[PDB]
């Protein structure tokens, strides 16, 4: 009865311009109306914008007012947002959200959408970690892969997900070149020293680069 | 009616209106119960005072101060016997367009202020005293309009209450104030939004006229948000007025007994004419002022800057000016092609004091940036509106366009505002205002010496701020009027985009205003009124716009004919000339009796004592702007009027007015439509592609030796 | 214009604990404030609207209290699903502000990390790049301090501490530090030691190797 | 460097006219041109009209026009001495309508030097005491005007009465009590904001290179002060008294 399908959000370079959609199905935008939300990854929240399609009232934030353009097809109960002069701090995942009939009631949410602001697209460089005899200290050890200089993040597994326990995939950090780099590790016993050599598995979704790299002493 | 007409189907509802003119408005309406029985205390006039009030800490002061509201009006609308109405109609800005609900919030903030401070009594006695004075001192009245009003309330009031109609209030009813304050709630709101940006969305079309709208009811979130969020910010109640006069003393007439204003002060800076009230005997006074400057009509650019300057300037002190105009002190600021026009009208109390504050204000003024942007854009919207108006207004534009010395068009007025910056503007203004002339008419309850002191005051202040020095008597100029080649008839056409009606205007340069020509043109004007009324509009059923008459301009008299109808224009010319031949025969058809009764009609039409001090002041001021000063032209012209024959106007007709005329000064102008019993061979005219190159070989008129 | 002081920044407690979190408005506000929950990779949730009222469809263990500017979400009993970042928000016609974010974590024993280190690979050194990765795993709580040591000399400015969050299996934490350098410092600086100071390892430990 | 090598006489082309033709017309400019038919010399003479609205608005504007053109021409004169020394004479003049520019001389560097002239008077700075000396000096030329030969006085009245408007020399004398330099320095780019140029080019040149020189000039003008053309309704002249 309530359905918020936002989509259209893709990949773009800085200085560009995009347009996003939000389809409010199961009800009317002529009723209680929708909101736009910035959420940066690992960071807090912003209320970007709100149209009241019953009254045509736009309400913007203070920072990026004017440079962005909201629109609303009432015949489809579906709003839109033209974006312009796109900047590198706006790469995040954004939501559409319905306020309901209440004084502060913002109950429903949406599918979310992908916003990406990037200079370059690049396949990773994958260097396996080398747990040597000097790392052998006690019954506990580990092995990993340095995934370097890539560009949306890599889904990583081990021998195509054969060893999942002990696996820790540290989140990537965007470097100065507009690229990500991370490492995924897995703690192995000292019985696994030289017994089984695992393979970190690269599934980077947008650049479509798949490099299966083995970890060896 | 035992019922109201808004029976909870259309309450708490919204409308979205598509207008015909490019305006932006929000309309809020409250049907309210009867206070006709409550005429004794009459809270609605006090509420109408308190809604649209402009004062310290007021709502509208803040909304103007935030630049959200250009203008507003609110208050009680009369209705039937059972119910009455309460309307609120406000203007919209760009952010006013986006923040409408918050505007309603600001309305509710003022409501919260009204519940916060409750009823007020000193305001009620103060406004009661203002209506006391104003009902107390009335001179006389127009028998039309007044009698229709008091006959409107003759049904409702006893034979002693028909005079003391609403201008006296016995009691204070705070329960009534709170009662209608409880009636003014988000339960009771009707909403109407006016925008031309409504496209594809407003389906429900009007039956008779055809405008289109949509209901699209406000959801409940905003409503419940409207009740709980009721707080106050930086709101203050407005303060007691100080503009109340105790000057009530009528001054007895002195040894300087004149029926016309004398030049009591002359400088190379100023020129001052003065007369006191002989007839009306009121403590009030009327004051008229022209501020002359050369640079006013040098270009479109700076004239636009003058217009915007004067507009935003006048708007600045307007919030202060509201109590004065509320007290009965009216005024006018107006730019001219020549300079600025000032008017001060009201009582004798504080016109020097307030006027001192006015001179210091327009002398020393600062600019806000966003205020500048709003006024610049707003008049910019007012500029390209001028492509869409009525062809008679358009025709009067071309009329006053062609019949001056220089004239700047609206096109170049539109294009030249592309470069207007605020440092450029604010730098030019004191250079502009460095050196100028003032001429003034002062009339009412004062002395000559106090008038000298007021004038002295003003110009002293002027030299004090901007070091004003007088003008050169070689740069005391006027714009001249164009000579014709004495037999020529030229015409051209302009196509109206929007309107399907065609316009036309035909003009005659008779002469200067000599004593003969005034009576020539008045008599000829009078004789053509009723047969044109009889045949052209009535019988030929051409249109509704059919006007003729004088043109007193540049010290030159003139004759013009204003007709706008949906016809072929040369066809229309043919019936104009047919009316001319009709008058031609109607010359010789005049008896002696028609002659004598007709000139007696014109005499009593012209001769009349005034009925308003403002009336005779506008006439006198109309002399002052023409520098004529012929104060007794009326009796002079009547003395001429008695010396006139039929053959005089024959001889006036044959050489000057007839079709066989060596003194023919005839010119027509065509205003086209959207897609646009004997007639002789008219000469071929020529089209006017360049009006400057038109005027390139036309001579110029002399000006008048001033009387 | 009114900003929001979400107090405290964070805390840690287990299932069946009483957690009260106080957001404080900057001005005297009439309570239009909502309280939120958002699990990772999921849409947020309206816990409490109007800063005192419960949205329909939420258990009543949670409550909100208007106290002037001090606004406080009160959790009676924590749950295994209630470990998520929380928010509070002021909504007028003014633009809507938020809280600083409060992540809800569990209360667990003091777990000292396991400190590992990893030399860079060969072809990485053949690319003119040397990156040593010091590894931590299985520490509670998240609050630690890791300092790099190159030939027993403290290093700083080219490393980052990517710390994972509360583990789904056992609620532990894994830290990763990554020294980033040129190949010219690898054969020059032999001794690559990792100095770690966490609450459990308050005495600093120094895991080193020689290439 | 003004010594020429351009000595080459251009033979007459298809533009075989005894009178200068309008080879370029814009709403900004209007350009008439003729090559030397009779005399066949490498030299050239150039005539320029600078139209301005602000010319006879006040005594003040005339004072500022005079002072401006004078001290302006005086500035680059020390550079100009080699040009006049090379046999290249010129004239700057003002009118009641506007300014007058003449370029006379040889075929070498009239384009080049003229470019430097336009660039110089486009961006100019002011000294304070130089301003005072020129101000006082022309003030001495103003009360000199009380003493001259009566035929000059008669020609003054002749052109006084027989025009449309006329500012007298007396009020020109009185007006320098208030003439300040920021006021001038503010007026000048306002003066230069919007104006008309008309030009006559005569001598040992081609038509197309003349079009390029004109292009260069008006380009420079729009480049420095964003000059836009005038309206032909503010293209006025004065008419004479019946």
Residue numbers in the entry:
A (entry chain C): 4 to 154, 156 to 221
B (entry chain A): 288 to 963, 981 to 1011
C (entry chain D): 2 to 212
D (entry chain B): 529 to 770
From the reporting publication:
IDE can effectively degrade insulin, amylin, and glucagon, pancreatic hormones that control blood glucose levels, as well as amyloid β (Aβ), a peptide implicated in Alzheimer’s disease. IDE is a 110 kDa zinc metalloprotease that readily dimerizes in solution (Kd =~ 10 nM). IDE has at least two major conformational states in its catalytic cycle; open-state IDE captures substrates and releases products while closed-state IDE performs catalysis. Within the IDE dimer, each IDE subunit consists of ~55 kDa N- and C-terminal domains, IDE-N and IDE-C.
Apo FabH11-E-bound IDE showed a highly preferred orientation in vitreous ice. Thus, images were acquired with the grid tilted at an angle to the electron beam, which allowed better sampling of other orientations. The initial 3D refinement of apo IDE-FabH11-E of 151,868 particles had a resolution of 4.4 Å. Further 3D classification revealed three major conformations and structural models were built. The three apo-IDE structures derive from combinations of the IDE partial open (pO) and open (O) states. The three conformers have resolution limits which correlated well with their relative populations: O/pO (4.2 Å, 73%), O/O (6.5 Å, 16%), and pO/pO (6.9 Å, 11%). Furthermore, two subunits within O/O or pO/pO states have noticeable differences in the distance and buried surface between IDE-N and IDE-C and the dihedral angle. The IDE pO and O states differs from the pC and C states by 5 Å to 24 Å increases in the distance between D1 and D4 and 7° to 17° increases in the dihedral angle, respectively. These changes result in decreased buried surface between IDE-N and IDE-C in pO and O states.
